[PDB]
Amino acid sequence: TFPGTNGLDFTIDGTAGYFAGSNAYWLAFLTNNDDVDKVLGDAESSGLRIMRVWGFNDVNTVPSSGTVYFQLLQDGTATINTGSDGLERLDYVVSSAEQHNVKLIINFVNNWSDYGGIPAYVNAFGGSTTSWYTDEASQAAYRNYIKTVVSRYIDSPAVFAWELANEPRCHGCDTSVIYNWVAATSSFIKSIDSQHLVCIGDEGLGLDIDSDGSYPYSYYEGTNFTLNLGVDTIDFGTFHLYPSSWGVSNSFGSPWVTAHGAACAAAGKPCLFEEYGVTSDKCSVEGGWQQTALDTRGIGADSFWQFGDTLSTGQSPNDGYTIYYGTDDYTCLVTDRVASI
Ligand SMILES: *[C@@H]1O[C@H](CO)[C@@H](O)[C@H](O)[C@H]1NC(C)=O
């Protein structure tokens, strides 16, 4: 039975529960299978049921030999890499997730320039980071890429959800730009695969319910959380949380979770608290957020940003948010936490 929803709860194998997960954006960019297995086994033994990974890796020129990439976007043409240093790495991750009782969230483009993103489509096809949503050349490539990836794992019970993008924004755009794109893209996915969950991947910006007046609740980044969540072909909401990056205090975080949970409840769909992080005082600050998420109606799961581990190639990436397996912060925010759910 694939992961699903039942009212405000998520389900895995047909059973409802609150699920803890993490993010490991880089998992399908490794080239060592043993390291993939270590990460997913460490997640599994720690009680992480969901892992969110990048399902994209867009380049404007072919990288060095040995470097993983999933799509070359160059001079008006897309070329998808299905070889051993292309989407076969994502294949191994899905296989390993099936062997390790981990369900994956797999997304299809970045908002940001990291690993190409909407900027790499602009470089290849023209336009701008706001026009992208409605530009024919970009959207055709994007959809073809989506169909290419979805078709690889259409029958896998290890896919939690297909996710449109990482943190899509449309700065200054009418909120209908993203809304129509969400509706069209999610309907496209459901036309290919009627059975897996689909979500957006946005940060949750643009929310009137329980607003504190601060900028994250405004609609000027192009997203309207309640509007988009009403799309029939989206199964659950996503929101992220970075107070200092956003110009707000950490005290905004728990109320941000409360406000999104209320919005999810109103929509009749679960919310995934899909990224959150601070770079210091993690146990205390993130622990507070985690408790709010467990206590809030409509929050069905959460996944901290980000998982860390020791790989054969060295420590996995440290962006200051990384919580490494075997450390005290990992005990606080993962192993203790999951055991107590
Ligand atoms: C956000 O969507 C809600 C519907 O869920 C709508 O009532 C509100 O007007 C929208 N606001 C903007 C600026 O899109």
XYZ file of C-alpha atoms and ligand atoms in Angstrom:
355
model
C 0.000 0.000 0.000
C 1.615 3.333 -0.909
C 1.827 6.171 1.635
C -1.340 8.143 1.755
C -3.625 10.446 3.692
C -6.726 9.845 5.853
C -8.277 13.112 6.920
C -5.584 15.176 8.611
C -3.247 12.180 9.080
C -0.629 10.696 6.913
C -0.609 6.916 6.436
C 2.166 4.504 5.642
C 1.262 0.949 4.568
C -2.343 1.872 5.347
C -1.720 2.772 8.960
C -2.067 6.336 10.321
C 0.587 7.799 12.511
C 2.631 10.890 13.202
C 5.916 10.528 11.288
C 9.276 12.050 11.796
C 11.625 12.489 8.872
C 14.573 14.425 7.642
C 16.139 16.029 4.562
C 19.177 14.651 2.808
C 19.181 16.654 -0.428
C 22.405 15.089 -1.536
C 21.491 11.421 -1.220
C 21.070 10.747 -4.932
C 24.212 12.793 -5.732
C 26.494 10.252 -3.997
C 28.238 7.786 -6.165
C 28.877 5.066 -3.488
C 26.085 2.674 -2.799
C 27.419 1.689 0.580
C 27.133 5.318 1.679
C 23.493 5.514 0.472
C 22.779 2.371 2.464
C 24.515 3.703 5.551
C 22.506 6.890 5.525
C 19.199 5.159 5.004
C 19.996 2.449 7.581
C 21.018 5.077 10.102
C 17.741 6.962 9.399
C 15.788 3.726 9.747
C 17.386 2.623 12.993
C 16.824 6.127 14.437
C 13.116 6.033 13.572
C 13.048 8.445 10.646
C 10.258 7.170 8.411
C 10.506 9.827 5.659
C 13.559 11.268 3.856
C 13.278 14.194 1.452
C 15.847 14.224 -1.298
C 16.454 16.325 -4.401
C 15.028 14.680 -7.489
C 16.695 17.236 -9.705
C 20.277 18.158 -10.667
C 20.235 20.646 -13.558
C 23.374 21.848 -15.235
C 24.070 24.323 -18.028
C 27.288 22.578 -19.013
C 28.359 18.965 -18.545
C 30.210 18.570 -15.235
C 33.445 16.774 -14.544
C 33.606 13.054 -14.956
C 32.312 11.400 -11.811
C 29.988 14.218 -10.904
C 26.291 13.375 -10.840
C 23.801 15.334 -12.903
C 20.254 14.543 -13.991
C 19.594 17.073 -16.817
C 21.667 19.244 -19.109
C 19.849 22.464 -20.052
C 21.891 24.164 -22.813
C 21.110 26.507 -25.628
C 17.398 25.762 -25.793
C 17.647 21.986 -25.403
C 17.134 19.607 -22.507
C 19.059 16.299 -22.351
C 18.156 14.019 -19.437
C 20.965 11.861 -18.006
C 19.653 8.344 -17.277
C 23.138 6.811 -16.970
C 25.270 5.613 -14.119
C 26.099 9.142 -12.968
C 22.641 10.344 -13.720
C 19.190 9.081 -12.676
C 20.515 5.592 -11.973
C 21.797 7.164 -8.696
C 18.188 8.108 -7.811
C 17.214 4.523 -8.759
C 19.642 3.182 -6.143
C 18.246 5.565 -3.533
C 14.661 4.380 -4.174
C 15.808 0.729 -4.049
C 17.668 1.383 -0.853
C 14.702 3.206 0.645
C 12.557 0.110 -0.110
C 15.141 -2.015 1.709
C 15.325 0.289 4.653
C 11.685 1.059 5.390
C 12.144 4.713 4.382
C 9.672 6.654 2.296
C 11.044 9.352 -0.029
C 9.854 12.807 -0.956
C 11.272 13.436 -4.465
C 11.062 16.918 -6.026
C 11.643 18.050 -9.572
C 13.283 21.524 -9.646
C 14.874 24.033 -7.348
C 13.651 27.614 -6.930
C 17.211 28.461 -6.168
C 20.336 28.323 -8.308
C 21.822 25.427 -6.298
C 21.841 22.338 -8.535
C 20.613 24.557 -11.422
C 17.060 25.354 -10.549
C 14.734 27.830 -12.235
C 17.915 29.953 -13.001
C 19.384 27.105 -15.073
C 16.134 26.849 -17.074
C 16.274 30.667 -17.626
C 19.835 30.345 -18.907
C 18.850 27.620 -21.334
C 15.387 28.771 -22.482
C 15.241 32.540 -21.826
C 12.912 34.549 -19.727
C 13.159 35.218 -16.035
C 12.728 33.505 -12.664
C 9.110 34.795 -12.638
C 8.226 34.172 -16.203
C 9.431 30.584 -15.909
C 6.038 29.417 -14.632
C 4.276 30.365 -17.835
C 7.153 30.120 -20.379
C 6.495 27.353 -22.925
C 10.033 26.161 -23.423
C 10.768 25.914 -19.756
C 7.506 24.306 -18.802
C 7.780 21.728 -21.581
C 11.218 20.706 -20.410
C 10.107 20.708 -16.784
C 7.107 18.481 -17.520
C 9.139 16.122 -19.633
C 11.601 15.851 -16.765
C 8.765 15.170 -14.336
C 7.330 12.431 -16.534
C 10.807 10.887 -16.946
C 11.355 10.667 -13.201
C 7.807 9.678 -12.138
C 7.849 6.845 -14.677
C 10.915 5.319 -13.037
C 9.201 4.708 -9.689
C 5.509 4.657 -10.533
C 5.080 1.278 -8.883
C 7.350 1.832 -5.837
C 5.873 1.803 -2.351
C 8.993 3.693 -1.168
C 7.827 6.972 -2.705
C 6.105 9.092 -0.069
C 5.225 11.882 -2.463
C 6.076 13.584 -5.670
C 6.881 17.212 -4.951
C 6.668 19.945 -7.589
C 9.707 21.974 -6.509
C 11.929 23.079 -3.658
C 10.660 26.420 -2.256
C 8.991 27.801 -5.412
C 8.522 31.522 -5.340
C 7.345 34.121 -7.802
C 8.477 37.408 -6.319
C 5.957 40.097 -6.836
C 3.790 37.895 -8.913
C 0.039 37.701 -8.697
C -0.668 34.626 -6.511
C -2.590 33.145 -9.473
C 0.681 32.475 -11.285
C 1.820 29.826 -8.837
C -1.762 28.642 -8.204
C -2.425 27.865 -11.882
C 1.035 26.235 -12.147
C 0.338 24.082 -9.077
C -3.002 23.012 -10.467
C -1.687 22.264 -13.955
C 1.490 20.525 -12.822
C -0.126 18.423 -10.134
C -2.908 17.390 -12.515
C -0.210 16.416 -15.021
C 1.455 14.192 -12.382
C -1.829 12.571 -11.356
C -2.507 11.848 -15.072
C 0.680 9.775 -15.126
C 0.506 8.321 -11.621
C -2.888 8.326 -9.950
C -1.705 6.613 -6.800
C 1.161 8.495 -5.075
C 0.737 11.614 -3.044
C 1.593 14.957 -4.618
C 2.645 18.153 -2.822
C 4.103 21.544 -3.704
C 7.287 21.984 -1.686
C 6.768 25.654 -0.881
C 7.861 27.394 2.311
C 4.290 28.194 3.335
C 4.516 31.930 2.705
C 1.296 33.844 2.222
C -1.220 33.143 4.957
C -3.978 35.199 6.534
C -4.956 32.658 9.188
C -3.370 33.481 12.527
C -1.016 36.029 10.956
C 1.264 38.046 13.271
C 1.707 40.699 10.621
C 5.244 39.762 9.734
C 6.480 39.440 6.180
C 6.332 35.618 5.889
C 2.552 35.839 6.100
C 2.440 38.290 3.166
C 1.691 37.301 -0.422
C 4.555 39.073 -2.170
C 6.617 35.943 -2.766
C 3.842 34.728 -5.102
C 2.440 31.915 -2.988
C -0.962 31.768 -1.213
C -0.888 28.752 1.084
C -4.664 28.251 1.491
C -5.393 28.902 -2.117
C -2.877 26.386 -3.339
C -3.793 23.772 -0.739
C -7.301 23.763 -2.114
C -6.111 22.260 -5.371
C -7.726 18.877 -5.727
C -4.636 17.264 -7.131
C -2.462 18.330 -4.082
C -2.819 15.941 -1.164
C -1.033 17.795 1.663
C 0.568 21.132 2.492
C 4.237 21.925 3.032
C 5.886 24.734 4.966
C 9.397 25.559 6.014
C 10.898 27.646 8.816
C 14.027 29.833 9.085
C 13.383 32.798 11.408
C 16.734 34.536 11.203
C 16.952 34.151 7.450
C 13.496 35.608 7.252
C 14.078 38.607 9.450
C 11.984 37.381 12.416
C 12.654 36.082 15.894
C 12.668 32.381 16.800
C 9.519 33.150 18.821
C 7.722 33.344 15.460
C 8.333 29.651 14.854
C 5.848 27.871 17.055
C 3.060 30.300 16.000
C 4.025 29.667 12.373
C 3.449 25.950 12.958
C 0.106 26.662 14.734
C -1.058 28.921 11.864
C -0.171 26.343 9.134
C -1.761 23.523 11.057
C -4.961 25.571 11.269
C -4.824 26.218 7.516
C -4.282 22.508 6.807
C -7.172 21.604 9.043
C -9.359 24.120 7.225
C -8.456 22.533 3.930
C -9.099 19.057 5.267
C -5.572 17.912 4.451
C -2.433 17.129 6.468
C 0.531 19.480 6.679
C 4.157 18.400 6.505
C 6.480 20.732 8.520
C 8.999 19.964 5.821
C 12.137 22.023 6.689
C 13.258 23.835 9.821
C 16.618 24.732 11.263
C 18.806 27.040 13.283
C 22.584 27.107 13.404
C 22.954 27.227 17.193
C 20.974 26.304 20.322
C 19.318 23.620 18.131
C 18.153 21.273 20.803
C 16.232 23.949 22.655
C 14.908 25.928 19.739
C 14.071 23.096 17.360
C 12.819 20.985 20.211
C 10.254 23.669 20.971
C 9.099 23.680 17.379
C 8.931 19.867 17.333
C 6.707 19.851 20.397
C 4.383 22.386 18.789
C 4.181 20.260 15.711
C 3.164 17.175 17.735
C 0.615 19.261 19.648
C -0.947 20.984 16.611
C -3.994 19.641 14.771
C -3.328 19.324 11.065
C 0.485 18.809 11.422
C 0.929 15.225 10.319
C 4.719 14.870 10.075
C 7.902 16.920 10.269
C 11.337 16.756 8.787
C 14.265 18.766 10.086
C 16.833 20.408 7.777
C 19.105 18.467 7.565
C 20.476 14.968 8.154
C 24.183 14.516 8.580
C 26.342 11.400 8.582
C 29.895 10.121 8.164
C 30.355 8.795 4.615
C 33.328 7.041 2.968
C 33.902 10.368 1.156
C 33.935 12.412 4.400
C 31.221 14.137 6.497
C 28.074 14.848 4.545
C 27.385 18.565 3.866
C 27.470 21.052 6.703
C 25.561 24.254 6.042
C 25.347 25.089 9.768
C 21.935 23.496 10.071
C 23.176 19.871 9.692
C 22.501 17.591 12.632
C 24.958 14.693 12.479
C 24.207 11.111 13.461
C 25.984 10.303 16.696
C 26.013 13.797 18.126
C 24.171 15.180 21.132
C 21.897 17.355 18.972
C 20.933 14.186 17.051
C 20.051 12.475 20.257
C 18.003 15.399 21.330
C 16.163 16.059 18.076
C 16.004 12.577 16.583
C 16.501 9.548 18.741
C 15.054 10.842 21.921
C 12.369 12.645 20.069
C 11.195 9.806 17.855
C 11.111 7.348 20.841
C 8.814 9.759 22.718
C 6.278 10.166 19.926
C -5.464 33.643 -0.722
O -6.376 32.594 -0.980
C -7.549 32.779 -0.187
C -8.336 31.577 -0.485
O -7.799 30.389 0.144
C -8.249 34.040 -0.699
O -9.470 34.146 0.162
C -7.365 35.216 -0.552
O -8.002 36.319 -1.180
C -6.045 34.925 -1.352
N -5.191 36.121 -1.268
C -4.277 36.431 -2.237
C -3.572 37.753 -2.105
O -4.113 35.593 -3.138
